[PDB]
Structure 1
């Protein structure tokens, strides 16, 4: 998956903004209240409306003084370039218009009926909503969300592992029944092989998270243990040779672990999904940890085909591949392409 162009009119601080995204680390740099998250949430609205997210509401997100909100997103997936267009009318949801098209040669052509329902169904088939919200787009303040519960984590992990190319093949063979030694034996074989493949994926996620978290904490925590048990995915950190629960960590260490785990999932998915969007990675991190973040950008974020990073921290500029500066001018966001 690759975002190419985002056009936004009258969404929060954005009156008329166009952003071209590219390969590599795209950094959006801006002060508090400049329009960074507004841009990222417009992308989320563009892709997945209707949302049932409490802090995102149409009546609220229309720019003050305007009546009409417009979002136009162009992205690539599996070789096909897609375009989704949405228009919202403030306080009057009957002028609301939605469209999703694909690029056929030189022409944009409808890929489904121009309706929220049809577009939603199509998008869900392209990239499941739960995968996007919990493994691709990490909203401001949600870095440690995947640490807080054996509910959201188990679900996203299971759904992430479900993206494996052989998953549907496994499930099918599991359905046949001849009551024969051949059928039973084969289904048992498939079930075992699938379980081992998952365990390997989870081990690989644990390996990556361990390497990143050890780098982050200068070896203070020697491993991040990721263990599937029944309907749970357990997470531990190893300190002085033994597994400890996540409450062992400090507030800053928790952010560091969240980043480690997010990155590890994105790296495991670098081929299948290939996109990470991260909004303000520095909260609670001390000076040393922010420095390590730059190192981890160089060594890990560079290994994900497309990354969109948003921050107020100027020191991250040097580690990005493309820099866009956003600022608030006359009550409207202004976007400047630096790199």
Structure 2
């Protein structure tokens, strides 16, 4: 795994920086023998992941996932995310939308599932699913 994560780091940093309004300038992916360590740069110094708040963690996780899919956009080309907004406050949710129109759109195919209507804005195609009589009903919108 060591060699793996030491490739997407720069992209994850980039994304995480815009996700948190520069609050965290960078994401470091170091090696520690049979176990990789991830740190965040706060006020110019590296801090362990425990440093983050819960919502910040979800943001860093989204950043890695997108960075990952991006790095592999050629060989894999697909990312499927199930509910990306839990723990995000109103502001981080609006930032997510920007990160969608900016990075998520760089992936050939993305299937995103969510209860959050707000995400409809940065989607290329929209499908509605609802429960109509004990069974799921699917409606194509965008």
Q: Deviations over 1:163-209 (max 9, x none)?
A: xxxxxxxxxxxxxxxxxxxxxxxxxxxxxxxxxxx988644301111
CA contact (8 A) 2:2 2:35 kept: no
Q: Deviation at 1:233?
A: 1.2
Who is 2:135 aligned against? 332
Distance 1:334 1:227 in 2: 47
Distance 1:245 1:273 in 2: 30
Q: Does 1:251 align with 2:31?
A: no
Distance 1:219 1:260 in 2: 14
Q: Deviation at 1:331?
A: 1.1
Q: Deviations over 1:275-323 (max 9, x none)?
A: 1000000001010100000000000001111000000110111101110
**Structure with bigger gyration radius:** 1
Q: Does 1:270 align with 2:73?
A: yes
- The SS at the match of 1:229 is coil
The TM-score with structure 1 as length reference comes to 0.41
Distance 1:232 1:199 in 2: 7
Distance 1:202 1:318 in 2: 31
Q: Does 1:317 align with 2:120?
A: yes
Q: Deviations over 1:235-269 (max 9, x none)?
A: 11110111111111001001001100111111111
Distance 2:100 2:14 in 1: 14
- The SS at the match of 1:232 is coil
- The SS at the match of 2:129 is strand
Q: Deviations over 1:121-155 (max 9, x none)?
A: xxxxxxxxxxxxxxxxxxxxxxxxxxxxxxxxxxx
Distance 2:109 2:31 in 1: 29
CA contact (8 A) 2:27 2:41 kept: yes
Distance 1:284 1:320 in 2: 21
The TM-score with structure 2 as length reference comes to 0.95
CA RMSD of aligned residues (A): 1.5
CA contact (8 A) 2:2 2:36 kept: no
Distance 1:260 1:333 in 2: 32
Distance 1:201 1:277 in 2: 20
Who is 1:83 aligned against? none
User: Runs (4+) of structure 1 moved beyond 2 Å?
Assistant: 198-204
- The SS at the match of 2:17 is helix
C-alpha spacing 1:199/1:231, structure 2 compared with 1 (3 Å) = closer
CA contact (8 A) 2:62 2:84 kept: yes
Unaligned runs of 5+ in 1: 1-197
Residues paired across the two proteins, number: 142
